[PDB]
Amino acid sequence: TTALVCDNGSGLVKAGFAGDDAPRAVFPSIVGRPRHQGVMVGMGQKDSYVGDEAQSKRGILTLKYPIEHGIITNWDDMEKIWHHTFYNELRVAPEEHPTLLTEAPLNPKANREKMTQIMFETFNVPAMYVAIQAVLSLYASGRTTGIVLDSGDGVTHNVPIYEGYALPHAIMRLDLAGRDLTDYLMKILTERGYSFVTTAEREIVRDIKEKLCYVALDFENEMATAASSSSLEKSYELPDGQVITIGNERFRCPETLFQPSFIGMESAGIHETTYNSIMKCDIDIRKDLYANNVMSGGTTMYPGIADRMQKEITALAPSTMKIKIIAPPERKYSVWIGGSILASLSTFQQMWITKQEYDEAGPSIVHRKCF
Amino acid sequence: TTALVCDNGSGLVKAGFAGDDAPRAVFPSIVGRPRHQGVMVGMGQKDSYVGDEAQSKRGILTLKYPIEHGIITNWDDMEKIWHHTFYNELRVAPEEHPTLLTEAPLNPKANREKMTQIMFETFNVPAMYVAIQAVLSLYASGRTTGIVLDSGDGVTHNVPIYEGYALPHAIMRLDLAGRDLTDYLMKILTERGYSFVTTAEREIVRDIKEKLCYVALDFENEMATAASSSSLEKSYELPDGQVITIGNERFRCPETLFQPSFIGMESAGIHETTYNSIMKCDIDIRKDLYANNVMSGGTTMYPGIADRMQKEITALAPSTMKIKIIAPPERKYSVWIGGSILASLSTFQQMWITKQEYDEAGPSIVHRKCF
């Protein structure tokens, strides 16, 4: 029996079957509920709209994300999201299939315990597991060693792993990721005329950065160039045909990853956070971690986030290290791909929490590989 | 049991049965009372004449419209109008049938409360509902989405609706409609010789515009052409065989919809008012509103009011939008046709205010879908 692999990230549900090379279902983790009075007796009766069913049908809805910074904040909406994942998108009876869920490292024990409660008691799932997403990104990278800068919609976290031993004390986590970059670009655009301000307008600015934004290789020189010249001013066309011209903030958005002070956040950037996570490691492994900075998850998709990462780590690393950033094209799904790997391995079929074990041992069993 | 659908507009009572494709009764909302001394003992005893019984028999009567700008201003005459609607035109005992009334959006709560009081206490109607006329125009257009430029005798109002959710904050209303255009043409004709001045002469000028008038596609060029040439001078024959020659004011009358300053009214025209009502909407719906400018009600019947509307909105809309104006032939009755749709739907049979509920809850119950 194929397992599900179900990377419910903060931004997109990515769900599929183990041993398949990409998710079937990829749709945003949004539940919209209508913010306006229904008058057409017939279709306005649908109480709420889930995922891609609600990113269209968008301007009528207040769009709520159930997961924020990798923590599930609303559970009735996450049961909606998962109900739609199994019975409308994947069309699988979850009574039938094991379920490899994932979550970020360093987040509340209540999230694994509620996810597992819901899987065992609402969806009756026969067995399940809850993998750390940056471990999955290594299974997806086909290597046992590396520091995974898994950066998502909710969270950026480094998990350094060496020869298959994670070093939990070196795991960094930032609550700084594509959603804080969305809400930042949504402000920087108001330095030009454009006031994106509601949810749903959040989804326009999201698509504006998922399209136009790129990482400056040398931020102060791109700022000097964009102040000098119109040569950066790509333009985008809003859902109503207004043309938005962007230019300077095209690269200032993802700079927030390297200068979190822009989003007002007291933190090292992702380059300093990756390097500081390597320095937390045993000196004897740092050569191999420096040679294997796997990147994964969507906000590592910005053009030039590798190369900028490499330039910055190479400025931090001690001048003889082969700083290598591994940013495959599929990195966008690497957490899921690695979950498909993991759930396919024969050595893994013992790791499922079976529902019998959850009933006998109680909810402590779910923290098997805790981080 | 068939419901009545009873679109008592400012201009015409349109009344019929639900699930029928057009009104049976269509007659003006006028009550005439004789302005002259009766001398023939026998027929002059009829105190007042209602509807088409009084648009003929016309020059003897002062013709009063009970409804002005969609607001019922005289209630004894509206009870006359409805008494004639049920017992002389439709020949239905209203004790027997539910009654779907309609009214404009954004008008006094006292109008729904008095209409419903009269239906429940004079006519004993078993159950009733009071729909917004521009919602009905969408039921008549067979679509859930669109901005309805419902323009009547009394009121022009836009109700934008998207996927069945009306956006009440975007509802525009103008007290500028076919009656203000009648009273304007009745003045512009006195630039030529013709002094229409009484009521009843109002009905001649009404018929003069319901026949001769058309919307200029490019008003300043039609003005230049009509000043250059007699080629626009259609002529009409008054009820006494005088020939009236019109020409230039043939198109200056309905231009008042696009330039309300002509009737001295501080307002955006109907094109600017429709566009401004789309801009009040969420940016994510404006593409579908721009592609569905339903038009309804009688003053949208002028030749070239679509196409002029399309040209003007396309001048306002941002050059990539499919500005589509939906102006079906039956638009004249679309509010009623849509009320026949609505009152036929099985999902609607719960929405009737039953007289028991009105007696228990009091008159607040009537504002169920308020706008």
Partner: peptide, 7 residues
Amino acid sequence: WXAXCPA
């Protein structure tokens, strides 16, 4: 504003 709202 230039986009997003009326001003």
